[PDB]
C-alpha cells in the first residue's frame, strides 16, 4: 500500500482503497433503492459516529448487530474498492461524483458536517497511523494543502457547499457533529424522525448510550482495531482519538487560526451560519 493520491475527474483519491474502477461504479451505478440509506460526509467529520447511531436505530437498540459485525460492513463505502435491504451505505464523495441515479430517486441522505478546523486536526493525527495516507509532513504545509483542497477528496469547502445544495429536500437531512455533541439524544430522535423509525424511552436511551464516544471506543467492532496494520497502525495510535468539540484550539497557533479564518471567509462567502461559526 503506497500512500499516494491518484485523480478521478479532478479529485484526489488514496491509492489502494480506491481505483478509477471503484469510484466510477459508484458514480454510474443504477442500484439505488427507495428505502436505501446513505451517510455522506467529508472525512474526519464523524462519519463513524453516525454510522453507529443509525445501526442502533435500525435494530431499535439491539447492540447485537454492532457488537458482532465490524463497522465498515454495517455502512459500506460506495467508492471503496469493495463497494456495496434496508441498505445502509456511506460515502465521502463530493456531490459531483456521487451516485447520479440518486438525484431522481426517493433514497435518503444524511450529510454530517464538522467544524472544518477540527476536521484538519483530526485528519492530521489519523494520517500518521493510516496505511493508505502519506504522513502529514510539516503542520503549516499540511494546513496549506487542506485549505487548498490538496488532500484526499478535495476541498472541505467545496464538499459542504456542493452537498448543501440538497437542503430543502425532504429525502435529505443535514446535521453537524457539534449537534450530536451538544444534545446526542435530541439528535437521535431527529435523525429517527427523518428515517420514519421512532423509538420508545428504552430503545432511544439504548442507542444514545451505545453511541457515546467511550462506549464505541470500547467496542472492538466499532473502533477499527480489527483492521490490518497495513491500513492502520495499532501499535502507534487510535482511530477514535479524543472525540471532542474544538480540539483545534490546542493545535492551531494564532497565526494559523487567523490565516484560516481568512481562507474560510473568502470561501463561505454567503453561507448560512453553521453551529461552529463563532
Ligand X SMILES: Nc1ncnc2c1ncn2[C@@H]1O[C@H](COP(=O)(O)O)[C@@H](OP(=O)(O)O)[C@H]1O
Q: How far is the CB of 65 from ligand X (least distance, A)?
A: 16
Stretch that binds ligand X, among 19-27, 37-45, 103-111, 129-137 (CB under 6 A): 37-45
Based on the residue annotation, tell me whether 159 is a catalytic residue of this protein.
Answer: no
Among 34, 135, 183, 277, binds Na ion (CB under 5 A): 135
Q: Which CA distances in Å does 151 have to 14, 44, 68, 70?
A: 9, 12, 33, 27
- The phi-psi region of residue 46 (left if phi > 0; otherwise alpha if psi is between -120 and 50; otherwise beta) is left
Closer residue to ligand X in complex, CB, 62/247 = 247
Q: Which is nearer to ligand X, 100 or 131 (CB)?
A: 131
C-alpha cell recorded at residue 111: 450529510
Binding mask 78-117 for ligand X (x = CB under 6 A): ----------------------------------------
Given a contact cutoff of 8 angstroms between Cβ atoms, the answer to whether 23 and 97 are in contact is yes
Least Cβ distance, residue 133 to Na ion (angstroms): 5
Q: Is 241 annotated as a binding residue?
A: yes
Nearer to Na ion, 15 or 263 (CB): 15
DSSP 145-209: HHHTT-STT--HHHHHHHHHTTTT-SSEEEEEHHHHHH-HHHHHHHHHHHHT----HHHHHHHHH
Q: Which residues sit opposite 13 in a β-bridge? A: 6
Distance CA 53, CA 77 (A): 16
Residue recorded with cell 478535495: 154
216 binds, among ligand X, Na ion, none (CB under 5 to 8 A by kind): ligand X
Which residues contribute to the site for ligand X (CB under 6 A)?
41, 43-49, 122, 125, 211-213, 216, 240-243, 247
Residues tagged in the binding site annotation: 44-49, 72, 77, 92, 114, 122, 177, 211-216, 241-243
Which residues contribute to the site for Na ion (CB under 5 A)?
133, 135
Amino acid at each position: 500500500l503506497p500512500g499516494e493520491y491518484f485523480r478521478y475527474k479532478g479529485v484526489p483519491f488514496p491509492v489502494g482503497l480506491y481505483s478509477l474502477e471503484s469510484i466510477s461504479l459508484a458514480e454510474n451505478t443504477q442500484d439505488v433503492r427507495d428505502d436505501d440509506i446513505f451517510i455522506i460526509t467529508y472525512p474526519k467529520s464523524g462519519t463513524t459516529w453516525m454510522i453507529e447511531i443509525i445501526c442502533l436505530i435500525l435494530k431499535e437498540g439491539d447492540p447485537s448487530w454492532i457488537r458482532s459485525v465490524p463497522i465498515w460492513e454495517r455502512a459500506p463505502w460506495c467508492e471503496t474498492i469493495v463497494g456495496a435491504s434496508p441498505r445502509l451505505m456511506s460515502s465521502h464523495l463530493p456531490i459531483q461524483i456521487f451516485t447520479k441515479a440518486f438525484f431522481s430517486s426517493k433514497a435518503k441522505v444524511i450529510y454530517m458536517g464538522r467544524n472544518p478546523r477540527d476536521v484538519v486536526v483530526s485528519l492530521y493525527h489519523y494520517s500518521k497511523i493510516a496505511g493508505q495516507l502519506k504522513d502529514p509532513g510539516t503542520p503549516d504545509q499540511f494546513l496549506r494543502d487542506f485549505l487548498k483542497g490538496e488532500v484526499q477528496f478535495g476541498s472541505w469547502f467545496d464538499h459542504i457547499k456542493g452537498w448543501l445544495r440538497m437542503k430543502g429536500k425532504d429525502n435529505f437531512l443535514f446535521i453537524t457533529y457539534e449537534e450530536l455533541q451538544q444534545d446526542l439524544q435530541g439528535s437521535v430522535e431527529r435523525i429517527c424522525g427523518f428515517l420514519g423509525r421512532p423509538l420508545g424511552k428504552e430503545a432511544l436511551g439504548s442507542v444514545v448510550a451505545h453511541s457515546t464516544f467511550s462506549a464505541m471506543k470500547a467496542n472492538t467492532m466499532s473502533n477499527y482495531t480489527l483492521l490490518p496494520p497495513s491500513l492502520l497502525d495499532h501499535r502507534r495510535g487510535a482511530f477514535l482519538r479524543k472525540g471532542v468539540c474544538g480540539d483545534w484550539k490546542n493545535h492551531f497557533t494564532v497565526a494559523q487560526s487567523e490565516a484560516f479564518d481568512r481562507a474560510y471567509r473568502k470561501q463561505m462567502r454567503g453561507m448560512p451560519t453553521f453551529p461552529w461559526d463563532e
